[PDB]
Amino acid sequence: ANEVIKCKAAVAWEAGKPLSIEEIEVAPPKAHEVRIKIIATAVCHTDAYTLSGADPEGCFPVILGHEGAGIVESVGEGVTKLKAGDTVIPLYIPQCGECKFCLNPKTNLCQKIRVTQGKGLMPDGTSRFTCKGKTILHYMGTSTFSEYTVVADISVAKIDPLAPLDKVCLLGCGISTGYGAAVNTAKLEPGSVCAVFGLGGVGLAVIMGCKVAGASRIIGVDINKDKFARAKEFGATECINPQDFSKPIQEVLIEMTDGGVDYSFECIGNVKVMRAALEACHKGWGVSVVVGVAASGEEIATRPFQLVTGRTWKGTAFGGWKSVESVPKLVSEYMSKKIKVDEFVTHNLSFDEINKAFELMHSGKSIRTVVKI
Amino acid sequence: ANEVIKCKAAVAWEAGKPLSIEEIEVAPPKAHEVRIKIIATAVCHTDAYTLSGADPEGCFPVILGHEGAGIVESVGEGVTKLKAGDTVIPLYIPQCGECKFCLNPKTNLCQKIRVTQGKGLMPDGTSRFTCKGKTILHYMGTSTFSEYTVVADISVAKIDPLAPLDKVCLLGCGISTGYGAAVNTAKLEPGSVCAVFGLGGVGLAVIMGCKVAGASRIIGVDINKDKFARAKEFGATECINPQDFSKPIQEVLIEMTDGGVDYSFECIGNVKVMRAALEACHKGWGVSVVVGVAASGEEIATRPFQLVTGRTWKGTAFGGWKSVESVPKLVSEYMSKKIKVDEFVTHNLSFDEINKAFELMHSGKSIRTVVKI
Ligand SMILES: NC(=O)c1ccc[n+]([C@@H]2O[C@H](COP(=O)([O-])OP(=O)(O)OC[C@H]3O[C@@H](n4cnc5c(N)ncnc54)[C@H](O)[C@@H]3O)[C@@H](O)[C@H]2O)c1
Numbered sequence: 094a095n096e097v098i099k100c101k102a103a104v105a106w107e108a109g110k111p112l113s114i115e116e117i118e119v120a121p122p123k124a125h126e127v128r129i130k131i132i133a134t135a136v137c138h139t140d141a142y143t144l145s146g147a148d149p150e151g152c153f154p155v156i157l158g159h160e161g162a163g164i165v166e167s168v169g170e171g172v173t174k175l176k177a178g179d180t181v182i183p184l185y186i187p188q189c190g191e192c193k194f195c196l197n198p199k200t201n202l203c204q205k206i207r208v209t210q211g212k213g214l215m216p217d218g219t220s221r222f223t224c225k226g227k228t229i230l231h232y233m234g235t236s237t238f239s240e241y242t243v244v245a246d247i248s249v250a251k252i253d254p255l256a257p258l259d260k261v262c263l264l265g266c267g268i269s270t271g272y273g274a275a276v277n278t279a280k281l282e283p284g285s286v287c288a289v290f291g292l293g294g295v296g297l298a299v300i301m302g303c304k305v306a307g308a309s310r311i312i313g314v315d316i317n318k319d320k321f322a323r324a325k326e327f328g329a330t331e332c333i334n335p336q337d338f339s340k341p342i343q344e345v346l347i348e349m350t351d352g353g354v355d356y357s358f359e360c361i362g363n364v365k366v367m368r369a370a371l372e373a374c375h376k377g378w379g380v381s382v383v384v385g386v387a388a389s390g391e392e393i394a395t396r397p398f399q400l401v402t403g404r405t406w407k408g409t410a411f412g413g414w415k416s417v418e419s420v421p422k423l424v425s426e427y428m429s430k431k432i433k434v435d436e437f438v439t440h441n442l443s444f445d446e447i448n449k450a451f452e453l454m455h456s457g458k459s460i461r462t463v464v465k466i
Numbered sequence: 467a468n469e470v471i472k473c474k475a476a477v478a479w480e481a482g483k484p485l486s487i488e489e490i491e492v493a494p495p496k497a498h499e500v501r502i503k504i505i506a507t508a509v510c511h512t513d514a515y516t517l518s519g520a521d522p523e524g525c526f527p528v529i530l531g532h533e534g535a536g537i538v539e540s541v542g543e544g545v546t547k548l549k550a551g552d553t554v555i556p557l558y559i560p561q562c563g564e565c566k567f568c569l570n571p572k573t574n575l576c577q578k579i580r581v582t583q584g585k586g587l588m589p590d591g592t593s594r595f596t597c598k599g600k601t602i603l604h605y606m607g608t609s610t611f612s613e614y615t616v617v618a619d620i621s622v623a624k625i626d627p628l629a630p631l632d633k634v635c636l637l638g639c640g641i642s643t644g645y646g647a648a649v650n651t652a653k654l655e656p657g658s659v660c661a662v663f664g665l666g667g668v669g670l671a672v673i674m675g676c677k678v679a680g681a682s683r684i685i686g687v688d689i690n691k692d693k694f695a696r697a698k699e700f701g702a703t704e705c706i707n708p709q710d711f712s713k714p715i716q717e718v719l720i721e722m723t724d725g726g727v728d729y730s731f732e733c734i735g736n737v738k739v740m741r742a743a744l745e746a747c748h749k750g751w752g753v754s755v756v757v758g759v760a761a762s763g764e765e766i767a768t769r770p771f772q773l774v775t776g777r778t779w780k781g782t783a784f785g786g787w788k789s790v791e792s793v794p795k796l797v798s799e800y801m802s803k804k805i806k807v808d809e810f811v812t813h814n815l816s817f818d819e820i821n822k823a824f825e826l827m828h829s830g831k832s833i834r835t836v837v838k839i
Pocket residue numbers: 137138139266267270290291292293294295296314315316317320335360361362363366383384385386387409410411412459460774
């Protein structure tokens with residue numbers, strides 16, 4: 094049978110504090126649940142935001158982490174698609190394949206377990222984590238900051254057994270999102286003129302996608318010029334820093350492209366830049382995709398004239414990929430060398446040093462740091 | 467040769483004043499211009515806006531009117547596609563067929579003569595209108611409030627010689643716009659659930675378009691319940707008055723459609739309703755099209771979350787129809803009874819009574835008033 098597992102996990106006892114390396118207890122999988130041995134997990138600003146406690150719906154204590162890759166340790170009752178030994182990637186965006194969202198080809202927003210997941214609980218309404226006699230909450234349905242985690246069976250992507258887990262763990266977030274933003278949401282045509290605001294892992298993935306789609310011009314935008322070199326390696330035809338111009342960035346872009354770009358992607362989470370991104374789009378057919386996640390309460394704005402004259406405002410969640418069926422295919426595209434993953438890894442750390450990943454982010458020197466479990 | 471024509475015209479000497487029936491002079495067409503005898507003209511909210519004095523780009527004295535139908539009286543040098551006697555409809559959205567916009571299948575916003583047209587002048591930079599020794603400006607490149615007008619040769623649609631002009635003049639604006647918003651901009655699929663905000667001529671045309679596209683549900687929304695009866699005749703499956711509910715209209719719509727509509731159309735020009743229209747759209751795939759023209763300076767807003775979770779914000783100008791090639795086909799759709807036109811006419815007046823159209827308009831008792839020249 095599946096017995097309780099005692100392992101290590103990085104616990105966030107409270108907001109605004111460093112993660113704590115603790116010894117925790119991980120209950121066996123219940124019906125339709127999967128316990129996964131996490132081999133590698135990445136860290137990104139999403140975890141840091143929740144950690145800062147700025148997230149109104151963020152609760153503690155909790156085990157963060159949403160970019161993981163590992164191996165199925167055991168499955169609960171009724172699980173037949175997965176088995177111990179299967180190579181997998183936990184997904185914060187599940188795919189039950191039965192709800193109205195999963196059945197609609199235009200979205201990937203499965204709502205099957207959203208409510209419980211939002212409360213850091215499994216579908217049955219409880220947590221599988223405990224530490225020092227206290228219940229510890231799950232996070233984004235994945236909690237990859239643990240040697241072992243339990244997730245809903247519909248939050249699992251079975252992938253190629255040969256995939257390097259210390260790499261593909263990044264397909265659990267940034268890469269897949271940016272890439273999909275370009276090919277699924279925007280669906281840009283060959284020859285398209287693009288602008289990408291924010292050159293972090295998400296922006297680079299968008300550039301990668303724009304290149305795959307055959308974009309003619311890809312203009313990278315970031316206030317941190319250190320991001321430019323890698324952006325060009327990914328395919329950006331040129332990069333500009335808004336700080337080097339006195340006019341609003343959208344005016345600069347409009348001037349550089351004789352009217353504006355065909356497609357723009359905001360990968361920062363700044364509502365003022367989102368507006369700029371929209372207005373930087375060419376009249377008549379310009380399309381702007383919001384990828385960044387703005388702070389709660391903030392809102393975007395513009396004059397309706399912008400839309401009436403042809404521009405379209407869109408958004409994306411996890412690049413629009415129906416998670417369970419897409420992630421494996423994304424892993425295969427990486428294996429076949431169609432897309433990149435390795436190039437996103439800027440730093441590597443051991444589990445005990447996980448907190449260093451946060452310092453790296455606050456230094457502005459990282460795309461994606463990989464932490465070895 | 468082509469002589470100066472002395473005729474009557476409804477002149478707007480100044481903002482905030484009613485139109486004046488004056489004796490004017492209409493110069494002969496210069497190179498690439500067409501002089502048209504206006505047989506019928508309608509009046510719509512656009513004209514009134516300029517007349518009010520609120521339009522920041524409105525100048526006087528000027529001859530308004532952009533919804534007309536007539537007969538070519540004579541053509542200027544270099545014109546071979548058109549000849550005296552041809553049945554036509556003046557277009558405020560031209561189609562030179564050569565510029566970047568005309569060449570692009572995704573837009574209908576020809577920019578060839580925009581500059582001069584915005585100044586109420588012909589392409590050569592001058593006006594063909596004079597009255598009591600003063601130059602009178604052109605309006606929207608059409609100036610249909612005159613027995614005779616002169617337009618750029620690229621601002622003309624040659625139509626079916628059998629079309630009743632006291633009817634098809636309406637295809638010069640409202641009907642074509644609303645209809646196109648549904649079939650060109652939204653391109654809704656059969657079975658779609660739609661919501662239409664504003665049940666005037668534009669909203670009714672949208673409904674007509676939704677019905678032609680095979681929508682399963684068409685929910686009309688207007689604060690004036692007198693608009694409901696005609697909306698249902700056009701195909702609205704039901705009509706609701708936001709004033710009858712205590713919660714935001716978007717919540718009402720979400721509730722009655724189990725998540726929101728597939729497509730919504732704002733046909734009012736109210737930025738608050740535009741937001742509601744966007745938020746009334748179903749998560750994951752909802753699309754909202756802004757058709758209404760908000761007062762300059764006003765802005766639309768919402769939380770990026772709405773877009774990130776799948777909703778798309780669009781706009782439309784003249785229903786996205788490439789004017790010159792489309793209008794004739796729309797007249798044919800009317801002639802073959804595919805679309806309606808007659809049903810939009812609520813009142814008829816003689817030229818001398820033109821000002822009553824504005825009164826009818828503001829009283830809220832009209833869809834479209836047709837003025838017989
Ligand atoms: N939609 C989704 O499914 C989804 C998924 C993952 C992440 N995201 C969001 O994507 C965004 C980017 O993720 P990331 O990992 O790349 O973060 P990141 O911090 O590493 O990258 C942000 C980049 O934007 C740059 N930037 C900041 N302000 C700027 C400005 N005013 N102008 C130009 N550049 C500016 C930053 O310097 C940095 O290079 C975040 O908002 C993240 O929450 C969305």
